[PDB]
């Protein structure tokens, strides 16, 4: 037992030494010659109303016209963002929802929460209604985020240190990922649809490969828990936020930390993070009752998109990159460009 | 208008959905939500009987609709999940009396720590608590042979049931630190009739009256 612990400590020291030897130059000394974006301002173009309680998640479609939103009233709504209309309203069985997803083929949606069950709904039928296609069960805690991998494969992460991959048609798990110690809060699929990364309540993140099931790599460094993770457009980076008023930029190949986004006047929490269509703007949702826009390569700018009367809890960006949607606890949803 | 027929049909659809949503939401703000809490094996099963994931129980009493939520099945950290209960009318807390000597560090001190952590939480600075003390028969039949100094050295009172009950109740109620904003109600868990629901009905009526008056700056 002692020999195993000594070997583990030696391996950790060797990994740290290799990482230190792999760090030669920093990007903070390269972007000093880059012209900044300058002042960036945005204006409310539409305002979507109809929700009553808070808003916990939202997700864009694959064509940048249709929208999905989930509230604590046990309500799911499908909107059109070009004319401010309602295309569908879906009821729910459990009013405690914390995540949603939109199928890339425009056919299915998903919901989940504190009931430990993931519900999958089918949109296009012959009777004109929306029906409950599947109920996936097998977790023991609570679901935090669900994404559609393809039209017949789904991925879930829970608060039992477990991530799972499901085959919808069968109804049964095909692979399970374990190795965390605390709650898991986020995951973000890659464009090539072969890997995914997840962050835990223990100031750590892990990168996983789907086909095999073996944990690929582990990153640490935050002072406290990690609450939001997004994923870079090219598939070779990601950025995370903690409940410490701090954001970080990690890479999957250099195996080290790159940039830190923090400021002395910010002492609240971070609830969501997203990128832009060219990897030049980073949008963050804080608890100061406003959002923020960061220059992803220079790590200094504070272009507040204020306008909410409570905490901003979700945001998203279109596929063509021509709008930004924000949702907060004030029961309204706003569109920016 | 400058629209085709199909767009007019679309806006009619949207208006109809809006009406349905408003009706449902208005019908959904006419009910009482209570959150249950207690220590491990505190007898709260008796409370549920007399009246995985989240367990939701429903009942209707004297023209009110009560939703009780039981959260005992969860085992994760309570910090990242407790915020979704900001709008509750009341927190029910259940504590055991006949577990002062059993050590798991007895049960009484763990219950005290849990109460002191819950009552001063930031999300619950205006939410009332209903406190149940239960398992009193074994308590009355246990102090005839065991002294209260086994866990309360400072106690110097009579070896009678009433003095013990009063001391325990005052010790618990002394934990509050927001005396000007929210109250605390106490009751000994009965086992012979339907008082355990009447007490909650009275508590929620009083909470409604005080919220109504204090929302008007009166």
């Amino acid at each position, epitope marked *: 037992l002692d020999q195993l612990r000594q070997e583990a400590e030696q391996l950790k020291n060797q990994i740290r030494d290799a990482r230190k030897a792999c760090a030669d130059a920093t990007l903070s000394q390269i972007t000093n010659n880059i012209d900044p974006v300058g002042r960036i301002q945005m204006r409310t173009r539409r305002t979507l109303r109809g929700h009553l309680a808070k808003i916990y998640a939202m997700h864009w479609g694959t064509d940048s016209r249709l929208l999905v939103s989930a509230s604590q009233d046990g309500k799911l709504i499908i909107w059109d963002s070009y004319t401010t209309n309602k295309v569908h309203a879906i009821p729910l069985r459990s009013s405690w929802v914390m995540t949603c997803a939109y199928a890339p083929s425009g056919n299915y949606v998903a919901c989940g929460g504190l009931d430990n069950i993931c519900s999958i709904y089918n949109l296009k039928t*012959r009777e004109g209604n929306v029906r409950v296609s599947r109920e996936l069960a097998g977790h023991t805690g609570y679901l935090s985020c669900c994404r559609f991998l393809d039209d017949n494969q789904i991925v879930t992460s829970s608060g039992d240190t477990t991530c799972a991959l499901w085959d919808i048609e069968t109804g049964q798990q095909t692979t399970t990922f374990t190795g965390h110690t605390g709650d898991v809060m986020s995951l973000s699929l890659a464009p090539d649809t072969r890997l995914f990364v997840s962050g835990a309540c223990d100031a750590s993140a892990k990168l996983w490969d789907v086909r095999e099931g073996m944990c690929r790599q582990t990153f640490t460094g935050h002072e406290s828990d990690i609450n939001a993770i997004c994923f870079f457009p090219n598939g070779n980076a990601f950025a995370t936020g903690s409940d410490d008023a701090t954001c970080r930029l990690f890479d999957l190949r250099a195996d080290q930390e790159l940039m830190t986004y923090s400021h002395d006047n910010i002492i609240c929490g971070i609830t969501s993070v997203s990128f832009s269509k060219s990897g030049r703007l980073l949008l963050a949702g804080y608890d100061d009752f406003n959002c923020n826009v960061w220059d992803a390569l220079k790590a200094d700018r504070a272009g507040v998109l204020a306008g909410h009367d409570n905490r901003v809890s979700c945001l998203g960006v279109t596929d063509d990159g021509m709008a930004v949607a924000t949702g907060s606890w004030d029961s309204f949803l706003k569109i920016w460009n | 208008c400058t629209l085709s027929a199909e767009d007019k049909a679309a806006v009619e659809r949207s208006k109809m959905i809006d009406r349905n949503l408003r009706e449902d939401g208005e019908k959904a703000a006419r009910e009482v939500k209570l959150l249950l809490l207690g220590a491990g094996e505190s007898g709260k099963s008796t409370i549920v009987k007399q009246m995985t994931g989240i367990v939701e129980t429903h009942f209707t009493f004297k023209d009110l609709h009560f939703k009780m939520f039981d959260v005992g099945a969860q085992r994760s950290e309570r910090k990242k999940w407790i915020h979704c209960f900001e709008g509750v009318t009341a927190i029910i807390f259940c504590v055991a009396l006949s577990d002062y000597d059993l050590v798991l560090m007895n049960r009484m001190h763990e219950s005290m720590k849990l109460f002191d952590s819950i009552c001063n939480n930031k999300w619950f600075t205006d939410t009332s608590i209903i406190l149940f003390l239960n398992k009193k028969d074994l308590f009355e039949e246990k102090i005839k042979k065991s002294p209260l100094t086994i866990c309360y050295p400072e106690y110097a009172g009579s070896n009678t049931y009433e003095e013990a009950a009063a001391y325990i109740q005052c010790q618990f109620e002394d934990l509050n630190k927001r005396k000007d904003t929210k109250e605390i109600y106490t009751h000994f868990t009965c086992s012979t009739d339907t008082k355990n629901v009447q007490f909650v009905f009275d508590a929620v009526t009083d909470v409604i009256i005080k919220n109504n008056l204090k929302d008007c700056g009166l």
Partner: single-chain antibody
Amino acid sequence: VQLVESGGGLVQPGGSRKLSCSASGFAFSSFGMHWVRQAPEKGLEWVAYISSGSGTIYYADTVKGRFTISRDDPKNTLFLQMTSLRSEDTAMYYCVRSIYYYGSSPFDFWGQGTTLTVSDIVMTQATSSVPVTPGESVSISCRSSKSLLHSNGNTYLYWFLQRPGQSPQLLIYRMSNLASGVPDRFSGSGSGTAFTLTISRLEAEDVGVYYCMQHLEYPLTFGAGTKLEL
């Protein structure tokens, strides 16, 4: 999904007649309902429209004020009532569904029609018969009188088919799309005010009468019909 109509018959001049439609197998409270007419040996003709919520009711420019349209939602029944019938209303009638939101496909399911016997942008079909041979490519074109590309970017022409002794089924909706249950060997395109449909690799059960409609604004106008025969 099954709509069945009833009520047809023989009537003397004048009098009255009520026709009913019964639905089974879908949500009758999210679909608007049209009545369409077909002459004994001519093209189709638009008649009436009733919508979701009973808010909007249109009528024909010919017999307005003489026809009565109504719906009953809990029992799922659609009613038409007519009085004082002349000789111009000896024909067959069809009930059609439509639902309008972003992405839908109107005029999807038709009925079986009923028979009644009594003792405006211009659509004109170019031809009347085209003899063909299996394995050949066919183009069928019709014409209009004003532009159909609405400002928002749509296009509102409909291409329908009819085989012998049957009821129509939607081939192309909004002049460029493909419906459900239809073989993937069809196409349709047009240059403003004149349009053409293309069929490749002909086969049996693909011979009959083709029709082209508009829906830019009420009322809607029909054509004579193109007969494709072997």
